[PDB]
Amino acid sequence: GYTVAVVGATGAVGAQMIKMLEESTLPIDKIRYLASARSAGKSLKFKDQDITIEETTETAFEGVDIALFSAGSSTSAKYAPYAVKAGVVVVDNTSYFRQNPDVPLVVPEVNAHALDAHNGIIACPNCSTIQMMVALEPVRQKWGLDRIIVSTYQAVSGAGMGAILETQRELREVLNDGVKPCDLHAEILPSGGDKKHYPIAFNALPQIDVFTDNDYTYEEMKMTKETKKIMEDDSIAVSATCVRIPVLSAHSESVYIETKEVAPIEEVKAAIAAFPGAVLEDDVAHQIYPQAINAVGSRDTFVGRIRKDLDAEKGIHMWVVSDNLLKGAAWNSVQIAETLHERGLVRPTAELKFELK
Amino acid sequence: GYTVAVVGATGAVGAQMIKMLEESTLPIDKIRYLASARSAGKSLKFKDQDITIEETTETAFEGVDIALFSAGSSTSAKYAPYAVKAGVVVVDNTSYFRQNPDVPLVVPEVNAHALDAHNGIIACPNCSTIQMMVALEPVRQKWGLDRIIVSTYQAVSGAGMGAILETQRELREVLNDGVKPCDLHAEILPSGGDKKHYPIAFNALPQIDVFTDNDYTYEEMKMTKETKKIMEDDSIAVSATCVRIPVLSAHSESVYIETKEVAPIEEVKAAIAAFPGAVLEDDVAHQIYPQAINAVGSRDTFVGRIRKDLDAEKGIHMWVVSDNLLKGAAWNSVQIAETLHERGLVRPTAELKFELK
Numbered sequence: 249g250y251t252v253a254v255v256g257a258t259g260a261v262g263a264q265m266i267k268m269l270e271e272s273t274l275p276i277d278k279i280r281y282l283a284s285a286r287s288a289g290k291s292l293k294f295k296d297q298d299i300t301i302e303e304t305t306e307t308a309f310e311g312v313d314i315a316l317f318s319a320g321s322s323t324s325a326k327y328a329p330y331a332v333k334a335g336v337v338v339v340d341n342t343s344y345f346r347q348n349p350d351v352p353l354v355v356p357e358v359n360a361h362a363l364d365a366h367n368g369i370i371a372c373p374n375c376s377t378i379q380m381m382v383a384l385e386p387v388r389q390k391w392g393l394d395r396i397i398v399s400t401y402q403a404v405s406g407a408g409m410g411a412i413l414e415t416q417r418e419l420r421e422v423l424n425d426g427v428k429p430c431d432l433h434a435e436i437l438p439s440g441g442d443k444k445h446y447p448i449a450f451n452a453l454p455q456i457d458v459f460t461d462n463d464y465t466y467e468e469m470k471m472t473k474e475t476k477k478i479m480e481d482d483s484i485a486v487s488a489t490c491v492r493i494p495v496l497s498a499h500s501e502s503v504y505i506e507t508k509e510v511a512p513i514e515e516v517k518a519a520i521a522a523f524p525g526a527v528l529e530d531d532v533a534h535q536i537y538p539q540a541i542n543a544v545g546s547r548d549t550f551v552g553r554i555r556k557d558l559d560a561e562k563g564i565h566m567w568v569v570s571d572n573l574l575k576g577a578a579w580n581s582v583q584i585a586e587t588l589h590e591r592g593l594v595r596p597t598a599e600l601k602f603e604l605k
Numbered sequence: 606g607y608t609v610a611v612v613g614a615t616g617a618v619g620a621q622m623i624k625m626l627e628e629s630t631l632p633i634d635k636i637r638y639l640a641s642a643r644s645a646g647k648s649l650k651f652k653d654q655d656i657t658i659e660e661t662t663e664t665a666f667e668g669v670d671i672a673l674f675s676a677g678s679s680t681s682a683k684y685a686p687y688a689v690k691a692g693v694v695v696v697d698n699t700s701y702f703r704q705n706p707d708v709p710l711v712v713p714e715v716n717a718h719a720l721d722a723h724n725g726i727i728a729c730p731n732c733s734t735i736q737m738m739v740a741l742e743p744v745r746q747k748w749g750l751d752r753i754i755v756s757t758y759q760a761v762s763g764a765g766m767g768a769i770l771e772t773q774r775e776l777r778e779v780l781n782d783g784v785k786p787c788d789l790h791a792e793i794l795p796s797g798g799d800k801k802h803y804p805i806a807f808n809a810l811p812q813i814d815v816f817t818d819n820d821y822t823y824e825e826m827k828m829t830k831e832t833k834k835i836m837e838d839d840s841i842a843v844s845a846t847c848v849r850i851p852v853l854s855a856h857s858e859s860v861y862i863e864t865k866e867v868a869p870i871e872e873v874k875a876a877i878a879a880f881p882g883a884v885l886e887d888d889v890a891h892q893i894y895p896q897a898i899n900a901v902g903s904r905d906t907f908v909g910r911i912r913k914d915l916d917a918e919k920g921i922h923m924w925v926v927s928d929n930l931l932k933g934a935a936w937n938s939v940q941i942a943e944t945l946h947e948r949g950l951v952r953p954t955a956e957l958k959f960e961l962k
């Protein structure tokens with residue numbers, strides 16, 4: 249069996265990493281939980297066993313086979329190269345290594361083949377990208393993809409545990425104390441690293457991550473660049489608007505595509521239904537469609553509202569929902585780890601390709 | 606001065622119609638408040654005056670110069686034609702008369718010219734449509750509009766008082782009582798008339814109004830048809846996805862357009878800023894963009910996140926927010942009444958063009 253390290257075990261994703269590993273088929277001989285210095289000493293469960301949390305350092309990875317990183321891009325930049333040097337295979341949830349050409353950016357249902365040539369780090373894509381890839385791959389396979397326009401409806405748990413708590417307390421202040429939403433005090437949202445913070449209670453914040461130089465945010469540009477890498481097709485036009493709404497968990501997306509050939513809607517529904525990881529929830533006569541509150545706790549990605557554009561021959565609209573901490577993060581990572589096991593790819597990398605910092 | 610009747614004075618829009626009329630330049634000699642049998646005999650203020658609510662009937666409109674209707678489609682279908690027969694000019698905030706060729710469908714800043722030929726009923730468009738027209742008309746004027754794709758983020762007050770109360774109580778049950786969102790009992794949303802109801806708390810429901818036979822909802826098809834009528838251009842392609850989110854007031858929209866001629870973004874920003882009723886809130890260096898919580902209580906429509914599509918030469922994305930009870934309903938209606946007065950159009954229509962039910 250393996251020694252498996254969860255780096256960021258105390259966070260929003262880390263908690264779900266623990267659950268997914270507890271429910272995994274991966275043969276685990278030893279589990280280790282790693283976090284920051286201030287979490288060291290604390291205990292946390294793996295099944296009915298008590299695990300002491302350890303501080304993440306350059307020397308903490310000796311004897312580890314697989315490390316699942318979910319501790320911020322900075323922690324991955326600092327320690328993942330040391331893990332690879334120690335002979336670990338890292339599965340990283342952060343954005344840091346995603347666009348490195350020596351690093352496979354993987355959704356196992358779409359591009360598992362990319363794992364074969366890994367150099368010790370596999371990147372899990374952005375949550376909003378993953379669920380879109382699960383919904384759209386079956387369509388691309390049969391009719392191609394020319395362009396995507398997406399508007400997202402993203403849950404606050406995507407911003408971490410602190411963002412969940414900020415949201416709940418803001419809502420309680422409005423509903424229980426009568427505070428006007430626009431008078432609320434925020435510390436984290438829309439983006440913890442940015443200069444200004446805004447209330448999310450009864451709001452829709454059209455900013456996720458910080459702004460890039462082309463006036464799209466990094467979140468929107470991640471959807472663009474990650475789609476092209478995962479689908480290994482730079483000709484797919486992708487533009488996004490990424491919005492935070494007062495949902496605790498599960499992202500929703502209004503997705504517009506134009507295919508290369510006309511894709512009959514009943515066939516599109518059937519292709520999506522048949523694709524692993526995608527569930528068709530589409531029966532408008534009975535008001536059936538994906539909903540965030542229904543998707544929470546499921547590894548599946550739910551697709552509905554599927555209909556042709558009113559004017560564009562090859563245009564199709566749909567609605568895509570998935571749990572951002574599961575398929576969007578911890579489940580995608582555990583799936584990758586299971587696939588690495590299945591393919592005999594859990595072993596040390598001889599050549600180190602990532603700079604030690 | 607005028608005798609003005611507010612039909613549906615007790616509802617979410619009605620309350621704002623009162624506020625807008627109180628703050629209006631319209632010379633008002635007498636105010637009457639009409640509603641259903643449920644509210645008849647109760648009292649509401651107009652400024653310091655107590656006004657007794659009257660049950661709406663076919664004979665309640667004698668002596669009324671202007672009637673503002675915001676009491677549901679059925680109420681307008683039943684009583685507006687009797688008001689017109691009695692010599693009233695009706696400003697109607699329902700969908701019922703919007704597509705009737707004898708009824709101007711008006712946003713004053715866009716198509717006030719259409720008022721001149723009114724036959725006793727002027728329809729106020731759908732809230733989500735109004736704010737999109739204020740944002741897009743200045744762009745259309747200079748560069749044309751070929752197509753629109755919109756995904757909305759609509760507030761619950763759009764579905765009335767009952768839906769506001771339903772949302773507040775659901776959120777209180779989750780936050781104070783520890784109820785799981787999935788275990789909440791809903792009675793109104795997504796659509797009071799439809800067969801099944803779902804929780805909105807911590808959810809995003811991709812259904813507003815009921816479904817039509819093309820699998821778009823009536824809300825989505827209204828954005829399509831109303832746009833074409835208001836802009837007097839059936840060639841504009843419009844497809845919409847309309848989603849309810851947990852916001853009490855103010856709709857937000859992710860709007861994609863393709864213009865007929867390339868529209869430089871800095872010029873688009875200037876044109877929107879210069880357009881009456883539209884305010885540019887767009888400075889990403891300081892995280893300035895429209896927000897629902899900021900728009901509440903303002904008659905203006907706010908536009909930002911303005912940026913070119915990453916691939917389509919003539920494509921532009923933006924974020925449009927307005928208070929759905931103000932510019933989306935009560936302010937647009939009172940603005941229409943003010944414009945009618947300015948143009949000498951508050952007077953009886955000799956010929957009845959509407960069926961009596």
Ligand SMILES: NC(=O)c1ccc[n+]([C@@H]2O[C@H](COP(=O)([O-])OP(=O)(O)OC[C@H]3O[C@@H](n4cnc5c(N)ncnc54)[C@H](OP(=O)(O)O)[C@@H]3O)[C@@H](O)[C@H]2O)c1
Nearest residue numbers: 256258259260261283284287318319320405406408409572
């Ligand atoms: N949330 C989502 O839906 C989602 C989806 C896809 C990808 N991700 C990525 O997942 C990563 C984790 O996000 P989250 O939402 O789980 O954040 P979170 O709830 O704030 O948790 C942060 C975790 O990072 C750990 N950490 C912080 N600094 C550390 C350090 N210097 N050394 C070791 N551990 C450190 C924290 O440990 P302590 O408790 O000791 O501080 C905590 O375990 C982020 O990079 C995020 O971009 C998140």
Ligand SMILES: NC(=O)c1ccc[n+]([C@@H]2O[C@H](COP(=O)([O-])OP(=O)(O)OC[C@H]3O[C@@H](n4cnc5c(N)ncnc54)[C@H](OP(=O)(O)O)[C@@H]3O)[C@@H](O)[C@H]2O)c1
Nearest residue numbers: 613615616617618640641644675676677732763765766929
């Ligand atoms: N809310 C928005 O943002 C928005 C935007 C664009 C268009 N609209 C339209 O505005 C209209 C009202 O919306 P709302 O959100 O304010 O609804 P609401 O809060 O439910 O209010 C309903 C109003 O209709 C009155 N009413 C019901 N049945 C009646 C009857 N038989 N005769 C006379 N009055 C009756 C009610 O009076 P009681 O108190 O006696 O029941 C109440 O005053 C609807 O047609 C809606 O489609 C709303």
